[PDB]
Amino acid sequence: SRKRTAHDLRKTGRDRLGDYFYQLTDELFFMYLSGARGINKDFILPTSFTGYA
Amino acid sequence: SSTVIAFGDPKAQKKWSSELAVDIRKKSYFESRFIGTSENAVIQRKTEVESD
Amino acid sequence: SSTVIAFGDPKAQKKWSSELAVDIRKKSYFESRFIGTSENAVIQRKTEVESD
Amino acid sequence: ALIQSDFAQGIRMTPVPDCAGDVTACRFDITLKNAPAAGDIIELGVLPGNAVPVEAILDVDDLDTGGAPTITLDVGIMSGPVGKNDPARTCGNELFAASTVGQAGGVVRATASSAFRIQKAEDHRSVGVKVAAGPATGAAGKTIALILFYVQGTS
Amino acid sequence: ALIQSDFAQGIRMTPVPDCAGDVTACRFDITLKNAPAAGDIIELGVLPGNAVPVEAILDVDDLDTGGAPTITLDVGIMSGPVGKNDPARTCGNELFAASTVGQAGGVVRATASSAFRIQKAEDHRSVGVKVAAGPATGAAGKTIALILFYVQGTS
Amino acid sequence: ALIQSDFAQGIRMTPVPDCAGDVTACRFDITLKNAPAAGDIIELGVLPGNAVPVEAILDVDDLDTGGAPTITLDVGIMSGPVGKNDPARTCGNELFAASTVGQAGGVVRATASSAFRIQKAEDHRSVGVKVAAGPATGAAGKTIALILFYVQGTS
Amino acid sequence: ALIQSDFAQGIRMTPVPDCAGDVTACRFDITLKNAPAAGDIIELGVLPGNAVPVEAILDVDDLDTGGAPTITLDVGIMSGPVGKNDPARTCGNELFAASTVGQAGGVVRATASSAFRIQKAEDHRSVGVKVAAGPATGAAGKTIALILFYVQGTS
């Protein structure tokens, strides 16, 4: 699967993980301060989420 | 007639592009400006458990 | 899971080869040996109308 | 049965118009050395790529000899490759809907409303006659030949 | 009304044969909006300067959906230049007089002897269609199309 | 009418073995908030990569709370990609066929020979639930759940 | 005589776990050339070195059909080497004493208590299906499929 595509998937995977954790941490902050996960559909975490730790 | 290399013929060469467009990551509001130690930061971080 | 580019996915690059396979010409029999201008030839050629 | 006939193959050539709007015609003819059946596809001629029929003339000899003839010929574009011999290819009724020309020898020109609205295509489509009704008692070595005028560079 | 087609405005193109005698054809069509009415003139297309009709083919949809349809299309040459928008422009009954096509789908060809006797003139005359009789009742998006064959080097 | 699970959309993931011949399981579950109706297709989970089911353990609760129960679930491998939300995606009857669990509620394991002879595929295939017979009185808040013992690197 | 599947002869490799107590499965199957008969020993697949079965799923496709079927399968562990063609090797009733599957097409699971009590032996051993009773009529081409779960590090 790394030969059928010219793009190297390892570097893109690392970049996507970095952006993923950026989004996850800021949306974690926004739900905890606000007090509910609500209805936002772009949040990483699914609905019916009641705190992680 | 005339040689036509039609749209669906297998010889119709394509060229894939090296540049890969990427979604821009969502900007994060709570940068280092807010997350700081001491009393006067909106979201303070407790440093007791960092090393111990 | 794990990424699979799979088969037939528009990401799957294909390389077209430049070399041509040619159905070669059938070897001719009545070559320059047989065709001649003299009497002693299986196929005689008459130059009485090549310039007139 | 799909009956290949010269023009559909690479044997005889159909001419490209050149220039725009130049009416171009070739005579696509077949010597049917067999008797048409209830269901046949007779690939008469090749409508060259990127050209539309302007006028279609169907020239056909007597196909049926028995009393009360019922042969109907349907002339239409049959989609697929230029001359690939498969029974999967099926034509329609564009240049002719249901022709009475089969009952006795004669010529009937294109009279369907949709005959002149054929759209372009970048590849060599083919024109095919389907006998859409029973040959009845008759038929022998005969000729069916349409004369369609196609123009390139249409809009 | 002077409902002009794309060809009259110059948006589309009309072909000209390079050599004298080459029968050239372009499909003059309009997808007219609204309804046909008594006395309106539809300027379908323009035959080029040195050109005479060689065969005219008129195909239309059902321009009236009613009881006892009575629409009668008349097509002919118009007077003024191609693009000038003046209601003071009249057609004739040269190519088709009381064509009585439009009650059914149909396809009609030139029948009057005056269709083939048109005289040439150096400038781009415009071929227009005038609905002579009433449109009976009702027609919204049905299209009218006329196909002309013209040669350029006639005598 | 797809009721997509968290597994199909991509929120909750599915494990993949890192060694051939290594049974891996993840209970695919939904919490459908409407009473199932005839023709509904439920996309429980995705069968990742080159894997084949070995044992299927359905875990549906009481879906009919009326009189004589009628619901008959059946599961299979849906055709299209895992994430597309097209209503027109078919469901097979491989792992279960007219399974009668859900009328009373409980656990039923694979009892059809087709459940173990699944063929591999290089893409990701999503396991779907189709309710063959409409419930007499559907139950609203109950959950259905299927468990796959899919193993990679088979022959 | 011994009918060997691909797994015993070594053509098709068998999986071994790379972890302690990691459940591993493989579809031990054979396609039966000619028809089964009483006393036939089918050497389905090889149980790996130190592993012991933890659950065995047997599925067959209607071996004998006919009427009043009398076929009964009997699978177990053979004392002989991995793939030696010695006709003196015997099959014990460890996993399935009398499967009574193959009378009609279906799937049966290990039920006898002796299935999970197999002791480990440092050498490979071959799991063998023995047809205890002759089949009525019988069929040719029907496959015997055994799905075996074993853990490679039990105490």
Side-chain angles (χ1 to χ4, degrees), chain D residues 132-152:
Chain D
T137 61
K142 298 295 186 182
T143 49
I144 57 186
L146 74 165
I147 311 169
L148 59 84
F149 305 88
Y150 51 86
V151 298
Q152 276 197 353

Side-chain angles (χ1 to χ4, degrees), chain F residues 30-50:
Chain F
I30 67 161
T31 300
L32 72 164
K33 301 169 202 69
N34 297 320
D40 284 330
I41 297 194
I42 286 168
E43 183 151 271
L44 291 177
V46 65
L47 201 163
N50 314 293

Side-chain angles (χ1 to χ4, degrees), chain B residues 30-45:
Chain B
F30 286 121
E31 266 199 345
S32 182
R33 304 182 340 260
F34 297 102
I35 297 169
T37 176
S38 74
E39 293 179 353
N40 278 315
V42 183
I43 297 169
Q44 76 166 351
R45 49 194 212 85

Side-chain angles (χ1 to χ4, degrees), chain F residues 70-124:
Chain F
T70 77
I71 185 163
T72 50
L73 286 68
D74 64 17
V75 302
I77 305 300
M78 293 177 70
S79 62
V82 54
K84 274 192 71 43
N85 195 117
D86 189 66
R89 308 204 303 146
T90 184
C91 182
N93 314 337
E94 275 78 355
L95 310 183
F96 295 128
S99 178
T100 187
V101 57
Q103 313 214 90
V107 173
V108 164
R109 324 177 171 282
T111 182
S113 166
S114 297
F116 310 143
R117 256 200 293 288
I118 301 299
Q119 300 295 335
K120 326 191 310 172
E122 197 52 58
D123 207 346
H124 291 317

Side-chain angles (χ1 to χ4, degrees), chain B residues 10-16, chain C residues 10-16:
Chain B
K11 313 149 282 302
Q13 284 200 29
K14 318 182 37 178
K15 291 288 291 191
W16 281 272
Chain C
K11 271 183 299 319
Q13 288 209 7
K14 181 188 319 193
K15 289 298 182 185
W16 274 271

Side-chain angles (χ1 to χ4, degrees), chain F:
Chain F
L2 295 184
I3 313 284
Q4 274 195 299
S5 69
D6 268 352
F7 283 71
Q9 299 178 1
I11 290 157
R12 279 193 289 182
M13 294 296 172
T14 175
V16 286
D18 63 358
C19 302
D22 198 315
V23 171
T24 61
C26 192
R27 54 183 311 278
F28 300 153
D29 57 10
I30 67 161
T31 300
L32 72 164
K33 301 169 202 69
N34 297 320
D40 284 330
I41 297 194
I42 286 168
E43 183 151 271
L44 291 177
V46 65
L47 201 163
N50 314 293
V52 291
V54 172
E55 178 156 49
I57 301 168
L58 209 49
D59 201 75
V60 65
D61 288 351
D62 203 57
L63 289 188
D64 293 28
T65 61
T70 77
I71 185 163
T72 50
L73 286 68
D74 64 17
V75 302
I77 305 300
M78 293 177 70
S79 62
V82 54
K84 274 192 71 43
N85 195 117
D86 189 66
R89 308 204 303 146
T90 184
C91 182
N93 314 337
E94 275 78 355
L95 310 183
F96 295 128
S99 178
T100 187
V101 57
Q103 313 214 90
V107 173
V108 164
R109 324 177 171 282
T111 182
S113 166
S114 297
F116 310 143
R117 256 200 293 288
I118 301 299
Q119 300 295 335
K120 326 191 310 172
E122 197 52 58
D123 207 346
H124 291 317
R125 318 216 300 292
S126 69
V127 180
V129 162
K130 174 143 64 68
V131 291
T137 78
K142 331 300 281 173
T143 62
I144 74 171
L146 179 139
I147 309 171
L148 278 176
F149 293 172
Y150 55 87
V151 59
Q152 271 198 359
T154 179
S155 296

Side-chain angles (χ1 to χ4, degrees), chain F residues 18-23 53-56 109-113 116-117 149 151 154-155, chain G residues 12 15-16 18 22-25 27 55 57 59-61 106-107 109 143 145 147 149:
Chain F
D18 63 358
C19 302
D22 198 315
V23 171
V54 172
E55 178 156 49
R109 324 177 171 282
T111 182
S113 166
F116 310 143
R117 256 200 293 288
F149 293 172
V151 59
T154 179
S155 296
Chain G
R12 254 211 290 270
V16 296
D18 50 316
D22 196 321
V23 167
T24 285
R27 264 200 42 87
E55 208 193 1
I57 304 179
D59 60 294
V60 300
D61 291 331
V107 171
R109 286 162 154 77
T143 61
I147 278 164
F149 298 166

